[PDB]
């Protein structure tokens, strides 16, 4: 897990920043090859945040997950990733408008195996958003940046927060209580981002605002032209109680389904 320096080249490309610090292309020197990366460059507690992060991802192994390739103690604490170069599923598709519709149906239900992964691990994303979803190739999606992620106690199915507000569901909102199944309801969200080729969702609202729309019932409308079957599918994501709320496996069925149908004409 711990790599060496003098083996990293820092590219001058930003890939992302805040907070934290930068997010930095760069290139990374194997048993033999080079290998392409996306560096998490910090710049006392944001250790912990990084090494945390580390030991979330060191954890998981999935095709829809990005890999981490190791930490770097170096200049600045460096998690060192494996660069998928067609960028994040919002700004691709804001930037290429003629993504066909079995196209986005195939990338989020490459998430959503992604996500049915992490549930069946019982680790919690709490970022799961169209800006969090990159593209490997315009065929193949990976779910990433795992900086509020967490592992859930053996002896309960959520996690209690002691904020990406538009993207959680009411029970995170109300009660700081984080399960798989508010997960899904973020998914919705990424879903509705996605099919409205990357726009923000609750457009112009405050945070307040949005939790009064939810509150009396009203959801996101329909974006123009998403199929149907889609639009329904974000309206159960939106389920208002976390009981009747679909997991992972329900959605990752239904959106498996769907394609099918759209592949073959
Ligand atoms: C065309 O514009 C881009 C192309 C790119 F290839 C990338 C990129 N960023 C990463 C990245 N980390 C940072 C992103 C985490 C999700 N939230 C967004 C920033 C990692 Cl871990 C692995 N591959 C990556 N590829 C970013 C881009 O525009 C921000």
Redesign the pocket.
């Known amino acids: 897990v711990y790599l060496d320096r003098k083996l990293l080249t820092l590219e001058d490309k930003?890939?992302?920043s805040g907070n934290f610090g930068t997010?930095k292309?760069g290139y990374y020197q194997m048993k033999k090859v080079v290998k392409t990366?996306?560096?998490?460059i910090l710049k006392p507690a944001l250790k912990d945040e990084l090494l945390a992060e580390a030991n979330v991802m060191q954890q998981l192994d999935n095709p829809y997950i990005?890999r981490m390739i190791g930490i770097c103690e170096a200049e600045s604490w460096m998690?060192v990733?494996?660069?998928?170069?067609?960028?994040?599923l919002n700004?691709?598709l804001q930037?290429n408008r003629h993504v066909k519709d079995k196209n986005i149906i195939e990338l989020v239900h490459q998430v959503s195996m992604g996500m049915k992964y992490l549930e069946e691990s019982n680790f919690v994303h709490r970022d799961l958003?169209a800006?969090?979803?990159?593209?490997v190739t315009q065929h193949y999606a990976?779910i990433?940046?795992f900086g509020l992620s967490k592992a859930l106690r053996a002896d309960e199915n959520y996690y209690k927060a002691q904020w990406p507000v538009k993207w959680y569901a009411p029970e995170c909102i109300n009660y700081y209580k984080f399960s798989s199944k508010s997960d899904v309801w973020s998914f919705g969200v990424l879903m509705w981002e996605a099919f409205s080729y990357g726009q923000k969702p609750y457009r112009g609202m405050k945070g307040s605002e949005v939790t009064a729309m939810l509150e009396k019932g009203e959801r996101m409308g329909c974006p123009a032209g998403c199929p149907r079957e889609m639009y329904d599918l974000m309206n159960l994501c939106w389920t208002y109680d976390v009981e009747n709320r679909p997991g992972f496996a329900a959605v990752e069925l239904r959106l498996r389904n769907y394609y099918y149908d759209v592949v073959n004409h």
């Open positions: 930003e890939l992302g997010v292309k990366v996306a560096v998490k990005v998690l990733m494996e660069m998928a170069e067609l960028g994040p700004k691709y930037q958003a800006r969090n979803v990159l593209l990976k990433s940046d």
